[PDB]
Symmetry: C2
Subunit: 217 residues, 2 copies
């Protein structure tokens, strides 16, 4: 509860050091941002006092540094892939995915079957079109299958945490040399991991485990 926080924050703040100057600068950016409302927003955010806020900022900055250091050169190389465009149909039942594949193999419209049967509300009204996306945008299971396809090829059912996908590859962009794009791949992985609560929390559990400490969620 309040103890887990202290400990979890102590492990991160001790390993990923940030200067009090950097912490105080982030604190001042919040004071000028709200002014005389600082106490209210601080109260409304459920913070004891300014000391609690500072400790929460120290944690955020240390966590940000930890997420930035979590990106290895191997991680950057593992995301060096061409941007691809694909369509998909998502269903929860594996037999339903096999029956969808059977219909597409006969010539049935991929777009119309996606509009009727896909469970993916973000793409079903576009006939299953996901548009162009980079490596790391979709689930690893989906990505692994999509990059194995040839343009126009339809996958067999692909299991992912979201259900079963029938995937059609529809586009592949030219890829610039690694040295030309590696800085941008690293920036993208840094941002995606920082904006992902699931990653930042799995990183905390692993960090406590590396320190030989077992706690409850």
């Amino acid at each position: 509860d309040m103890l887990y926080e202290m400990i979890a924050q102590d492990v991160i703040t001790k390993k990923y050091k940030v200067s009090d100057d950097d912490v105080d600068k982030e604190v001042q950016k919040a004071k000028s941002q709200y002014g005389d409302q600082f106490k209210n927003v601080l109260k409304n955010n459920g913070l004891k006092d300014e000391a609690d806020f500072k400790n929460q900022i120290k944690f955020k900055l240390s966590m940000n540094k930890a997420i930035k250091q979590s990106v290895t050169e191997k991680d950057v190389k593992d995301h060096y892939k061409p941007e691809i465009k694909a369509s998909h149909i998502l269903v929860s039942d594996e037999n339903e995915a096999k029956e969808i594949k059977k219909k597409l193999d006969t010539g049935a419209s991929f777009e119309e079957l996606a509009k009727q049967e896909s469970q993916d509300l973000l793409s079903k009204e576009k006939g299953g079109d996901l548009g162009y996306f980079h490596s790391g945008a979709m689930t690893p299971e989906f990505e692994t299958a999509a990059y194995k396809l040839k343009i126009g090829q339809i996958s067999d059912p692909v299991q992912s945490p979201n259900g079963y996908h029938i995937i059609k590859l529809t586009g592949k962009k030219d890829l610039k040399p690694y040295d030309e794009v590696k800085n941008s791949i690293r920036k993208n992985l840094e941002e995606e991991r920082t904006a992902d609560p699931i990653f930042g929390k799995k990183l905390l559990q692993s960090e406590l485990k590396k320190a030989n400490i077992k706690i409850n969620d």
Copy 2:
């Protein structure tokens, strides 16, 4: 290592609160005690700087408060017993303890057998005499057996972490009413638990366990 310390100290210092005024007073008592040598003794003690020392004093005072609160009214009542005097012979082999008992039952001298066979160097040259002691002075196994004896009675072999004891009760003091001596029993348990590293460390492991945290020694 250095992380276990931080965490172990954070759990105790958070639960058993001590004022910064009390901590600073203990720090100043050390400064006037050594004067210009403070840095050297601090360096010789293996302390980073004065901040490290203060955190170690904060821990000591919080631990002292935790040990003082570990003494319950039940603990005081469990130590309300007359001071007793006993002699003993300590041997490591249970058959040797049975053979010693057989000899004493025939009339053999307890004092001479203790001088020859006892492994307890603190009492063997006194013929096994431990003098008068209060509840909590000896191991619970030894104490439990000693208080069951009648004056002059010899025990069968009593197993303790030290080996096997043959115990003879030789004295028992009058006991004042509980209300008259309970303050002194509490003071004695506070002091014995504070001067005992084994207790202070078993108290830390239990405190981490109450907080649902598993760490390695």
